[PDB]
Amino acid sequence: MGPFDPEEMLFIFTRCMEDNLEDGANRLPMLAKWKEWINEPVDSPATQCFGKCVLVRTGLYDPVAQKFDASVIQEQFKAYPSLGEKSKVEAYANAVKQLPSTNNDCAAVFKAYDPVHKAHKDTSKNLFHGNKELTKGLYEKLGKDIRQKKQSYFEFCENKYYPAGSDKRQQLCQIRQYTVLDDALFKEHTDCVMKGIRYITKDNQLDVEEVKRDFKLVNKDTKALEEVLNDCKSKEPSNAKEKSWHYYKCLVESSVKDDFKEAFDYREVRSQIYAFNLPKNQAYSKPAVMEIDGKQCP
Numbered sequence: 001m002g003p004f005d006p007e008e009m010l011f012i013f014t015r016c017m018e019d020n021l022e023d024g025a026n027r028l029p030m031l032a033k034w035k036e037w038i039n040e041p042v043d044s045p046a047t048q049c050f051g052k053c054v055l056v057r058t059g060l061y062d063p064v065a066q067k068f069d070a071s072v073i074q075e076q077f078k079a080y081p082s083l084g085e086k087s088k089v090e091a092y093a094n095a096v097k098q099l100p101s102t103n104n105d106c107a108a109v110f111k112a113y114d115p116v117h118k119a120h121k122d123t124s125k126n127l128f129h130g131n132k133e134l135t136k137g138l139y140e141k142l143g144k145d146i147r148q149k150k151q152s153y154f155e156f157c158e159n160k161y162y163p164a165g166s167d168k169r170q171q172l173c174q175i176r177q178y179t180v181l182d183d184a185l186f187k188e189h190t191d192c193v194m195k196g197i198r199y200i201t202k203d204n205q206l207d208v209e210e211v212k213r214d215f216k217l218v219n220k221d222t223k224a225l226e227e228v229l230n231d232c233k234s235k236e237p238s239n240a241k242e243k244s245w246h247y248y249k250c251l252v253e254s255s256v257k258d259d260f261k262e263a264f265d266y267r268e269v270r271s272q273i274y275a276f277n278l279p280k281n282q283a284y285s286k287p288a289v290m291e292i293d294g295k296q297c298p
C-alpha cells in the first residue's frame with residue numbers, strides 16, 4: 001500500500017480513469033473535469049465509480065472494513081513533508097477519520113467522501129502528487145531513479161540495470177528477445193519490470209487479474225493462462241525477491257509463451273503513456289514481425 005510516489009499515483013489515477021470513463025459523447029468532457037480534480041458530474045455512475053476506484057487503490061476507503069482510513073494520509077505526509085502543511089494535513093486526516101462507516105458501493109463511498117474532497121481539495125491534491133508544479137520538481141529530483149512521464153517502464157528498468165555506455169548494455173540484445181538469464185542482476189531487473197507493470201505486487205504477490213487484463217487486451221483467452229499460473233504458483237520459490245523472475249521465466253517457457261509475449265509486448269507499448277486509452281480507447285493491432293542504441297545485435 002502507501003506511501004505512493006508520483007508514478008504510483010499516476011498509475012492509480014490513469015487506471016481508474018481508463019476503467020471508469022464513459023464511452024461516447026461524455027468521455028472527453030468527463031476526462032477534462034476529472035483531470036483537474038473536479039469530481040463531476042456527481043450524479044454520474046462513472047464519476048462515482050472513478051472516485052471509489054482511487055479511494056480503494058490508495059487505501060483511503062477500505063472495502064473489507066467498509067470504513068475510510070486516514071492512516072494513508074499520515075503515511076503520505078511522513079514520506080513527503082514538502083507536500084503539506086502539518087495543520088492542513090491534520091485537518092484533512094481528521095475529516096476522513098470522522099466519516100462514518102460506509103457501504104462498499106460506488107454511490108455510497110463517493111457520496112461520503114465528496115464533502116471531504118471539496119473541503120480539502122488542495123491538501124489532498126498536493127499530498128498525493130496531483131499538483132503539476134510540485135510533481136515536476138519531484139520527478140526532476142528523482143531523475144533516472146523513477147519511471148518518468150512518457151517513458152516506457154521497460155526502458156526505465158533497462159536503463160537502471162543495463163545502463164547505456166556500460167559493458168552490460170549489450171545484454172539487452174538477448175533480453176529483449178525473451179532470453180531468460182540466470183544471474184542476480186537479471187533477477188533484479190525482472191523484479192523491476194514485473195512490479196512496474198503490476199503483475200507482482202509491492203509485497204511480492206502474483207496478481208493474476210493484472211496478467212489476465214493484458215491477455216484480454218490482445219484478444220487472447222485467459223483460461224490456459226490461469227492454468228499455467230496455477231502450475232507456476234505451485235513451484236514458487238521461498239525467497240520472495242525471486243518471485244518476479246520465477247513467474248517471468250515460467251510464463252516465457254510455458255504453453256502460453258506466444259500469447260504471453262504478445263500481451264507483454266503490447267503492455268510495454270502502453271506503459272509509454274499512462275493515459276494511452278484516456279481520450280478514446282485504442283484498438284489493438286498486432287505489430288508486424290535487432291538494434292540496441294542504433295548498434296546492431298549479434
Ligand SMILES: CCCCC/C=C\C\C=C/C=C/C=C/C[C@@H](O)CCCC(=O)O
Binds near residue numbers: 052058060135
Ligand atoms: C487520493 C485523493 C483523491 C481521492 C478522490 C478521488 C479522486 C481524485 C480526483 C481526481 C484525480 C485526478 C487525477 C489527475 C491526475 C493529475 O493530477 C496528475 C498530475 C501530476 C503530474 O502530471 O505529474
Ligand SMILES: [Cl-]
Binds near residue numbers: 148149150272273274
Ligand atoms: Cl505517462
